[PDB]
Symmetry: D2
Subunit: 453 residues, 4 copies
């Protein structure tokens, strides 16, 4: 069987692939949890890298760890954090609830990498010095989630907002009939509707920023149960300082309360709530847009979606956005479930929670840029059609009530539909105008003024 | 005979109950939606009252409505807002999506009340002047939700926080074994665990405050599609100014964007997210507490819950808290579903969304006070028992690894565990003391210092 | 009479004068002021049925004096007949086992028996052979089973019939199909409605598929499931009486008496079926409000009847989808409580009961409303529908075998620009003669393309 | 070469040299860089089965040349045999109908046939008689049905057997029951496990109950469900071939071809069953980790094995409950998508497929693991459990009729203060005699109280 170096944990024998930098513990964990076949996300591996490096830096600063060992860890951690080893983390997402396995995985890989550079490290004694698994994995998760929100999800939303706001301006005077309960209503502009979508996204950004104060709080330094036992007293504070300086994420901070920070994962539940709300907003926007398109003769035909690769263009991007929204809502239900079921000094749903929140960040980041660039940007409005429908709608007969009778007017509406003409063109055909000048029919039937832009 | 009145409209005879202040439209709506048998919540009726009164005030200020009619509306609306007519709103929660029926219900009742005071009002022309149903009902909902959050839920949480923080102080030095994965771990204090619960509640308060900027935004002044057609151009701003002054809720404000504010209900979805996160925290707290009191001989027996009737007490209040949390999570799923399915200028899930968010506010407010006063406040700790378990735990023979041989320390842990005595006393039964002095012992086996209180 | 005093032997209590409940209930009222909502009528009725059956069986086994049994039986019967829905004030959010509501039922039965000159001990007589832990869950499954068999299924059947009738009336009403919301090949309005009809029929099938477990009862377990302090066949006798009295053949003792108290999986399972029906109804109600949707700027395929009997709001479809949203949320609360039992007792029963019974009720009622006041009165805009189908680019492909892909594509471009039928566009380009007109009509037959 | 340049109708693209997919797939790869996760293996296999069956039938009806049919069949067979799981790069989040993945399958079959010297038109030949709208949903229900019958059910059966075995081995292992988490009357560990066992058995029954609808297939319905441009009996023939090749008698044509494409209710229904099983497992895994829970400060009723040959972390219970959480979330996403189809097509299929198939997989795998590496190796602390049962105040009431209530209460209080057994504390208060030690050891028989 293919190249399989042998290794000995006190328990016994074990065969790891030859190109593998992980070691026995990881290989066991691989045999123990063949459940989903999916391992850690890249963003998560990077965060473990950042964290291990910072810890070695601080351990060295406090003179607890020899500088040679520290430097080898730091350089190893840096490759991992730079995404050079995403293929060295084979452990299933569904593992020990504290994330111990993945933590040991990181330690083993760092020692293997340091060894190929002629330095010997003890996975636990050196790489895991001053740390518990119980404070390490949750800290990596909140680092990944915080980076995903600040460096990815927010800029992506900002780009979607800009693209919607641009349409709100270009279409400022594109008048159309409003719809409520799906029925004809008074006039709006396409530009007003898009400023509505634009605000929704802007509010999404505000709600993501509102959760950062708690999403960026870190458990590091709390160790086994939160008492910091066997860590130097200011380990957390120092580690976070190093992480902020290296990543530029001012949002990371030690936890207000070190017990709440390990016994619970409320910050992830809170952030998931914001992601879900954005999914709700996007569902609305994407649904309006595919309806506005929807195809040409038997639908609304208000706008034309660009083709993904340039006439009945399928609303492919709106289908992606709503599918993604559904996934975010599902993930969000799994996160709350795990959030609620901690016991005493440790919540043991972290690997499952991390997987769902990080996927939610990723999906929303990516579909938002796609939606902005390959759909919203290239939309075209059927200006004449929209305006002709607005000017032919019975909803706009009401000003006529001072100029003609309530029954005289309702008849205008009643024929305009029957004979299918504009209201103006109809008030001209029952002979009405004057005694109500033509010049003052135009005034009370000004659909753009009714939209009160 | 006596007690039913007969009423009429264009279709025929409605036949309402004699004491009813509602009229035909309301009675039809009653016949059209016999679905749940449950009508508007009190807090929602009050808000409709506040809103109608403020509208009449402003209509009068702008000289659009005769001061005599305005004053009769204002006084009628004030009785409604003061809860004197909660029995005059029979319409099912499941009705027209915009809340038109309940809006008409409010108008009819105000006109009936004004009439009994010798003033005639047209339900629509006077009471509904400058308003659409589409901006009125959602505005009432966000007024009710904002009041529930600021006047009731936050003070309730503050009370629950105080009671947990008090226990955190009283129990500062009550040392016990920590648990992770439900297994024995290093020492914590009961006080530390409670400071953790305390911070969860404090974070709950912070997350409710973080949503107010959007929960308090109001649609009033939009009318039918968000344009303000057939209303004074500054109606919204005036109405909100009156509501703020009357209620003292500085958090109320006109919407940033009047289209987003009617086409969507994202602020309710966002608020529900925070309520759900609080349900998640409470579930954890209530679970830890019922496990700690768990029944005396076959459970953990760490604390004793007070009886609701001032030796086995059922943890009744924790069962209420977790049942409530389950309901908040369900309600929050219905809110998101409705939030996502608006169309164009109007979201038509408002009555259903209002019912669920308002109930969620109410349940969390009430169970939080109950939990604080009738459970948390009266807890007692089994101090001796807790301390004896901590001093008998394998976890603590590691300070020994230096003063005695590893295979002797692990032996201390396995010797004590069997004879079931403290770890200090199994050092004595081996005689290790001397050659190991005493005070060095009580030094290394100091469980309270290990909790690092 | 403002308030009477009651004894607790652990304190004194003031209960309203017209109240048939006693001290324990009044305490429970002071201890759980949480939601302000008590037991549902269907749930009160079930507690009534159960207490009566228990007294009948206790008497049969000669454990309870026939005079006391008869007083309980008659009291229980008034409660089960809905005469005392106002005597159950205890909040839904209470002790997780439902002990409070169980005591409430006992107290009221004793008060009622007392007004007829018979003395009963709420616990010793009315609760004989029973625990709270097996009693409340049994009442819940009786209520849920009755709600499914006597109410929801008949309601669904009625909605099905009304959709099947439209499927027949509209068999030949041809229209353009839509996929991804874009024009597609022809369907009939009748075919779409047979599709809605089958969804409801499948809903009925999935409700019947859960009855074998929804109707399983815990009665006879007592406190932890062992049957301690009950006669070995108490459960079997009680269920036999309930089946005979109610006519619900679906009720049965539980396969395993421990699973039947330690868990509420039957409720979680039934909720799944209700939620699936909510999913189906959302689809149906959405298609229908879109098909309405208002007259000039929408699809205008059909006209909804007005409830106030040209612009009628889709009011009933808005009710159906709001209800569907509530069923989905209730279903999430039920699963949460279902999952969190511990050892011999699940303590989320009152919360689970409230949500599943409401879900039954809402779906029962909105289904009858939808059927009678919306589906039954719909009218189809037949000419309009057919003209749009005959004018669609999607029906030019059968022209391919007779003219090019290219002439077929120019025909499609021209019909849209000139707003004509495809058939008239073919005649206007002078393509007939050389394909004949009978061939053109064979090929452009939209009703045959739908496959009648 | 590094990048073969394939050409496309609207331009050109660079596909990896070792790629069997073609232009359309590569475009779809550039258009949906969303999740970075493609089709599941079980789903790729099902597309293979389906394409093969279709070619077989097209040939049977003499619509497709036997040489082309044979090359498709052999290509499809490699794909169905899992030899090309690396040729399906398209994101799960794509066109709602699954068109992209359907084209992906067609291109790969043509590339494979070409390497064997036969030319196939991806659309004209491999997609003959098929629409994307009936193909992808059919593949999904084939995958879900196979996952339920060949994998999940056998896994659950294994977990049931392992729990039933403990129910027998531990038949007389008496212990204190818990309700509310408080001491209660005696049960045996074997009774509790028969309860877990029945929950899993019920899980199996609820999966079987959904197969009649989970196994229904859309194939033959084409674009909108009318079957336009497919042979009248295409569906029926394709399903017959699939049943014969796979041995899955559960597969069947849909009852109504419109409902079968306009909706995905069968997936929503199946997800309901999977969710119920997640609820049951959460309960079972929770009881078990509490029964472990660690040795001195916990319950210490049983000892969990360590994973490979009393301080053992409950690692497998943590995996089960994490999985349960994921199934509950996936189940929420499935319902959301289920509800939001429009007219003749539900466009949430790729998302729904991904969630239901993962739910099957996770439950299958963690169920075997739980059974073999946890349940099988559990040991009960028999003496400890029995001593606690014999020392419980819950068991003094069978004494009420020899000593009274008050004495039975002093025995109970003193038993607790001095940590003695009840038996020993009755003797110590000199109650015996005039109560024989024989009357005493009959009334205090905890195993008889469990009524085992």
């Amino acid at each position: 069987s293919a190249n399989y170096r042998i290794e000995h944990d006190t328990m016994g024998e074990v065969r790891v692939p030859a190109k593998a930098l992980w070691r026995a513990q990881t290989q066991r964990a691989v045999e123990n949890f063949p459940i989903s076949g999916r391992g850690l996300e890249r963003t998560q591996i990077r965060a473990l890298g950042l964290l291990k490096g910072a810890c070695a830096q601080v351990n060295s600063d406090l003179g607890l760890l020899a500088p040679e060992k520290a430097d080898a860890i730091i350089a190893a951690a840096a490759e991992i954090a730079d995404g050079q080893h995403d293929d060295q983390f084979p452990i299933d997402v569904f593992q020990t609830g504290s994330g111990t396995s993945s933590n040991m995985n990181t330690n083993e890989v760092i020692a293997s990498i340091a060894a190929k550079g002629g330095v010997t490290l003890h996975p636990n004694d050196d790489v895991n010095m001053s740390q518990s698994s119980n404070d390490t994995f949750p800290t990596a998760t909140h680092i990944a989630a915080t980076e995903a929100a600040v460096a990815h999800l927010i800029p992506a939303l900002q780009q979607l907002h800009d693209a919607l706001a641009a349409k709100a301006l270009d279409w400022h005077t594109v008048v159309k009939s409003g719809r409520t309960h799906l029925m004809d209503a008074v006039p709006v502009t396409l530009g007003q509707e898009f400023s509505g979508y634009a605000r929704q996204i802007e509010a999404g950004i505000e709600r993501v920023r509102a959760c950062l104060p708690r999403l960026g709080e870190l458990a590091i330094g709390g160790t086994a149960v939160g008492t910091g036992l066997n860590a130097p007293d200011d380990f957390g504070v120092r580690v976070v300082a190093v992480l902020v300086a290296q990543t530029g994420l001012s949002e990371l901070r030690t936890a207000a309360n070190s017990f709440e920070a390990q016994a619970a994962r409320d910050g992830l539940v809170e952030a998931s709530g914001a992601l879900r709300t954005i999914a709700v907003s996007l569902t609305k926007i994407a649904n309006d847009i595919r309806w506005m398109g929807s195809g040409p003769l038997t639908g609304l035909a208000e706008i034309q979606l660009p083709d993904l690769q340039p006439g009945k263009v399928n609303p492919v991007l709106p289908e992606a956005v709503t599918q993604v929204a559904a996934q975010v809502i599902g993930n969000d239900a799994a996160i709350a479930w795990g959030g609620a079921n901690g016991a005493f000094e440790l919540n043991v749903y972290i690997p499952m929670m991390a997987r769902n929140i990080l996927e939610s960040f990723k999906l929303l980041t990516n579909v938002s840029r796609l939606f902005a660039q390959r759909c919203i940007a290239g939309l075209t409005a059927n200006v004449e059609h929209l305006r002709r429908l607005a000017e032919s709608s019975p909803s706009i007969v009401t000003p006529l009530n001072s100029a003609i009778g309530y029954e005289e007017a309702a008849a205008v509406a009643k024929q305009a539909l029957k004979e299918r003409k504009t209201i103006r063109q109809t008030v001209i055909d029952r002979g009405l105008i004057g005694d109500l000048s033509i010049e003052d029919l135009d005034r009370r039937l000004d659909v753009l003024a009714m939209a009160k832009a």
